[PDB]
Amino acid sequence: ARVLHMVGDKPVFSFQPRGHLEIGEKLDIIRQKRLSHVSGHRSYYLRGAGALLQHGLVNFTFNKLLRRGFTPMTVPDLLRGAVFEGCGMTPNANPSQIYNIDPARFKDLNLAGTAEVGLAGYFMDHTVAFRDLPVRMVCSSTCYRAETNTGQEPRGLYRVHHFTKVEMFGVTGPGLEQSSQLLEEFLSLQMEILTELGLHFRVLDMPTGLPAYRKFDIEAWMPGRGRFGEVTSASNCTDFQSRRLHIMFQTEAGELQFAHTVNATACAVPRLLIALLESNQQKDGSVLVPPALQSYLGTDRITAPTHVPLQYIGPNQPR
Amino acid sequence: RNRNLLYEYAREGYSALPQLDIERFCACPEEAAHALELRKGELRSADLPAIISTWQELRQLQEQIRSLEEEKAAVTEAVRALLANQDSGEVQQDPKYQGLRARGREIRKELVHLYPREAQLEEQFYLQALKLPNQTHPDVPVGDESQARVLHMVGDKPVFSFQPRGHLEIGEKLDIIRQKRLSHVSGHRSYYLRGAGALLQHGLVNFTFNKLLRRGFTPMTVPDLLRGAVFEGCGMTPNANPSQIYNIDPARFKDLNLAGTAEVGLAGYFMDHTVAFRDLPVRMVCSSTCYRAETEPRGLYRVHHFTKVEMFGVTGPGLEQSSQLLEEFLSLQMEILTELGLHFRVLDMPTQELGLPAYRKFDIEAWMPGRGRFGEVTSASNCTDFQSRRLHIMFQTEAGELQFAHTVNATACAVPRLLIALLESNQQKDGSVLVPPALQSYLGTDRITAPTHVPLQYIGP
RNA sequence: GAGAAAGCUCACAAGGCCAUGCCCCCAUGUCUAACAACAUGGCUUUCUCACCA
Ligand SMILES: Nc1ncnc2c1ncn2[C@@H]1O[C@H](COS(=O)(=O)NC(=O)[C@@H](N)CO)[C@@H](O)[C@H]1O
Ligand SMILES: Nc1ncnc2c1ncn2[C@@H]1O[C@H](COS(=O)(=O)NC(=O)[C@@H](N)CO)[C@@H](O)[C@H]1O
């Protein structure tokens, strides 16, 4: 858990830090009241400034990655079981992070846990020209997690079943150095994005998961939580996604070989929303908008919504 | 086997029981039978008399229950008040006390015995009644899809020197869309977007979002997972043998479904809530992925999953206001398609295909040269009285009264259909695809060229 | 996410994360003339053992 780099300064607030959920409910941007029946449990709805923030962050990250040449891509939502087995996630175990579609209605259909599985499926059983390498593509899709821990901080926005996460996938040449430098570049890009937003963050190194040869976790300081929170995870892999999925790249000589795979997460909307709202939180509850996202939001300073908040007329209310 | 989730919801007590429209047309049976036959929904006029008779019986049983309840409440209040005064053994010995106790016991037994029969009657009547469709606007033509009238057509088919090729072939040539040998990974009818295609999709969604945001629409995001009750309220069939909506495995999770459309999510968000009169009309624009089972042989015409921006708004109580809002939504669709430049014809939907929850529906079909037939890409539906009643969405007036509010839902654009129409319409002999001026800035390139990168080689056995 | 327990949760006084007041769940049912009291279940909280690709 060594800390490779620390950037930014912790904000100083005269008043006590306020939880992101409290600010959202007061601002009404995010509502999480009595949504068990309507949207299941631990779901969330974004409206007003919140929706603009989600779209702004996804578009800003996408534009920044595209300017650097990343090839934009999209992946199918439904994925087969073999693809998940190759990426190292197994749905056979009873507690699984992979939603499983009903077998009777559909055969071997599973929702994409993350966009990395979809991109890996794309490169399955194919040969990439030795000149094309390295190949970096950014895919943006909604990711659904089957299990979110409820033992600690259950009533929080930190962990949610469905979250928008930009994913960057890069195939590299046989040389280990090429993969390592590619991962380094990915880390630099994500660090640059966080610094641009202004969130205080520290990047550490995870010891030794088993599939990933190396890993990098970026944690962003959150005032409401009062502790550091992990916001991004870029993890290298070596001849494992290819050797499991039979992904091979033909070199100039023509010998069949297995290419290395690098997968990183540019950003996640829920954690970023928490950090942005809490870091810029003001005394009256207004949230300052960073200049980088001012153009996307179009509002210099967020204020209480003019529309009156929705009232609950349901039977489950004290009378 | 088969059980509604709305009646189950009301039975458990999660939400107030919905108010049906049977009373509205109960006055004249012939008018309702004729309208229902024209709609030709799952329910038929032949079975309507049974439903009306059961409803009347239910009303009578409820009235009887209310009378017994009033008598029981009166005896309980009188006995309690009398017991408080002169609370001694002599008062207990009084014949009035004994008679009131016996009457209370008899009333309790009668009410408990009657309750199960009434509950069974309510379940059967509401189960059959839910099938009944919404009112049909008089100006809606009656017939099949072909019979649908054409309101008007904007643009003309582009003149082409050579026969335009299919969208799938052009995509494979440019490698934007890859659909070959995808059975093992994503299953059948699965598509991939690469290079210019992905940028085109993002640019279209962002352009639509910005256009709607400037008009004042409030942005909204809806969770993909939704419960079955919301689906039933929307009017779609959540569970059926040929049902097209994906349901997660019951063992892992219960009552979880993938949203058919974004409007379903917005309706769930608005379920069991009220809105201030000043806020009305409220317009919300939501962009989200939609997965449809959909149970052409090849191509992007039928796709299991796709991304479509959906605009859903709750209007005022007056029916005129709902119609006016629908007209404004139609104008917005026309401006978006005129700006893109595609040739699109807006045709009023026929009564047969209107659907269970839609009062008035406008279908906009865009001409596809490669396909050779118009493709429906935009559908607007007036959910004025069905969705609000099913989900209890109401708007409180200044006085404090609650009046049901009409809901209008429409689709701004769909990435698969608009992509196919733009590619086929702007395809050229060299293979380059022209980019419309609106998407030129977002894409940044006036046209598209063969991909620089070497396309993938299939090494699969 | 799994198991289990409880009935309330939000807000205002006041002390250096919680001492006390202020307010103290929504439904379907067993005995009760009926409030309450015990069950089944929902929801809001709290206590446990575990994965975070
Ligand atoms: N339960 C969760 N709910 C919502 N977002 C999550 C969740 N877990 C992780 N994330 C987001 O996803 C990022 C990566 O964590 S991870 O999903 O477990 N690992 C990966 O995604 C890599 N395999 C490629 O992205 C986190 O930093 C956070 O932004
Ligand atoms: N099999 C399909 N695969 C991919 N896209 C489709 C498919 N069928 C229809 N669409 C697109 O989705 C749009 C929605 O049409 S619809 O599902 O029948 N009606 C709705 O979605 C309502 N929510 C309107 O707001 C169509 O106009 C078309 O653009």
CB A170 within 8 A of CB A262: yes
User: Which of A39, A167, A312 has the most B C-beta neighbours within 10 Å, making it the best mutation to test the interface with B?
Assistant: A39
Count of A–B CB contacts within 8 Å?
Answer: 214
Which helix H or strand E contains A293, and what residues bound it?
helix A291-297
- A211: helix, strand or coil: coil
% helix, strand, coil for chain B, step of 5: 45, 20, 40
Buried b / exposed e across B131-162, counting CB within 10 Å, b at 16+?
ebbbbbbeebeeeeeeebeeeeeebeeeeeee
Within 10 angstroms of residue B312's Cβ, the number of other Cβ atoms is 30
- B404: helix, strand or coil: strand
> What tokens appear for A247 in the block?
């992904």
Q: Any idea which residues of A carry the catalytic annotation?
A: 145, 159, 230, 233, 271
Measured between alpha carbons, how far is B103 from B183 in angstroms, rounded to an integer?
A: 73
Q: What is the resolution of this structure in A?
A: 4.1
Decide if A125 and B274 are in contact by the 8 Å CB cutoff: no
| Closest CB from B201, B230, B247 relative to A38 | B230
Q: List C-alpha distances in Å: A209 to A86, A96, A215.
A: 15, 16, 8
Task: Tally the residues of chain B.
Answer: 461
> Taking CA atoms, what residue in B is nearest to A36?
B227
> Taking CA atoms, what residue in B is nearest to A32?
B269
Give residue B14's identity as a one-letter amino acid code.
Y
- B317: helix, strand or coil: coil
Query: Which residue is listed with tokens 């004025």?
Result: B384
Q: Whose alpha carbon is nearest atom 25 of ligand 2? A: B410
Nearest to A110 by CA among A92, A140, A84, A139: A84
Ligand showing the shortest atom-to-Cα distance for residue B353: 2
Nearest to A73 by CA among A12, A130, A120: A120
Nearest to B307 by CA among A77, A266, A270, A269: A77
Give B201-241 as a DSSP string: HHHHHHHHHHHHHHTTPEEEE--SEE-HHHHHHHT--SS-T
Measured between alpha carbons, how far is A241 from A206 in angstroms, rounded to an integer?
A: 20
Q: Which positions in strand C are less than 7 Å from the protein's CB atoms? A: 1-2, 8-9, 11, 24-30, 32-34, 41-46, 48-53
Measured between alpha carbons, how far is B232 from A154 in angstroms, rounded to an integer?
A: 29
In DSSP terms, A203 is beta-bridged to A5, A218
What residues contact A298, with CB distance under 8 A and at least 6 apart? A52, B213
CB B160 within 8 A of CB A37: no
Chain A hits for B229, Cβ within 8 Å: 37
Strand boundaries in B48-195, DSSP class E? 150-154, 193-194
What is the tally of structural domains in chain A?
A: 1
Residue A53 covered by a domain: yes
Query: Which residue is listed with tokens 């990250």?
Result: A61
Nearest to B5 by CA among A79, A226, A37: A37
Residue A307 covered by a domain: no
Side-chain half-sphere exposure of A178, counting CA atoms within 13 A: 15
Nearest to A48 by CA among B266, B310, B213, B270: B213
| Closest CB from A75, A132, A246 relative to B454 | A132
Domain around A41:
1-302
Q: Hey, CA dihedral for A217, A221, A226, A231, is it positive or negative?
A: negative
Decide if A126 and B186 are in contact by the 8 Å CB cutoff: no
Pure H helices in A125-262: 176-197, 241-245
Nearest to B51 by CA among B39, B67, B36: B36
What residues contact B144, with CB distance under 8 A and at least 6 apart? B350, B352, B353
- Bond from prior residue into B238 cis (ω within 30 degrees of 0): no
Task: Tally the residues of chain A.
Answer: 319
Residue A35 covered by a domain: yes
Q: Is A75 on the interface with B (CB under 8 A)?
A: yes
In chain A, residues 240-259 whose CB comes closer than 8 Å to chain B: 246, 248, 250, 256
In DSSP terms, A261 is beta-bridged to A171, A237
Ligand showing the shortest atom-to-Cα distance for residue A149: 1
Give residue A84's identity as a one-letter amino acid code.
F
In chain A, residues 199-238 whose CB comes closer than 8 Å to chain B: none
Choose which residue among A233, A235, A241, A273 to substitute to test ligand 1 binding: the one with the highest number of ligand atoms within 8 A of its C-beta: A233
Nearest to B329 by CA among B290, B399, B378: B378
Measured between alpha carbons, how far is A111 from A81 in angstroms, rounded to an integer?
A: 10
Residue A254 covered by a domain: yes
CA distance B440 to chain A (A): 15
Question: Phi-psi region for residue B255, left (φ > 0), alpha (ψ -120 to 50) or beta?
Answer: left
Decide if A101 and B248 are in contact by the 8 Å CB cutoff: yes
User: Which of A62, A105, A136 has the most B C-beta neighbours within 10 Å, making it the best mutation to test the interface with B?
Assistant: A105
Choose which residue among B336, B379, B381, B382 to substitute to test ligand 2 binding: the one with the highest number of ligand atoms within 8 A of its C-beta: B379
> What tokens appear for A132 in the block?
């094309």
Measured between alpha carbons, how far is B136 from A288 in angstroms, rounded to an integer?
A: 50
Residue A310 covered by a domain: no
Strand boundaries in A58-183, DSSP class E? 71-74, 78-79, 110-111, 126-127, 135-144, 162-172
Cα A300 from chain centroid?
26
In chain B, residues 390-429 whose CB comes closer than 8 Å to chain A: 392, 394, 396, 402
Within 10 angstroms of residue B17's Cβ, the number of other Cβ atoms is 15
| Closest CB from A105, A127, A131 relative to B457 | A127
Long-range contacts, A147-151 (Cβ 8 Å, 24+): A147/A95, A147/A96, A147/A97, A148/A42, A150/A42
What residues contact A295, with CB distance under 8 A and at least 6 apart? none
Measured between alpha carbons, how far is A274 from A17 in angstroms, rounded to an integer?
A: 12
- B338: helix, strand or coil: helix
Chain A hits for B197, Cβ within 8 Å: 74
Question: From the CA of A34, how many Å to the C1' of C7?
Answer: 18
Decide if A124 and B185 are in contact by the 8 Å CB cutoff: yes
Nearest to A127 by CA among B450, B186, B455, B461: B455
Residue A316 covered by a domain: no
CB A141 within 8 A of CB A118: yes
Residue A314 covered by a domain: no
- Bond from prior residue into B158 cis (ω within 30 degrees of 0): no
Measured between alpha carbons, how far is B92 from B379 in angstroms, rounded to an integer?
A: 72
Which helix H or strand E contains B23, and what residues bound it?
helix B22-25
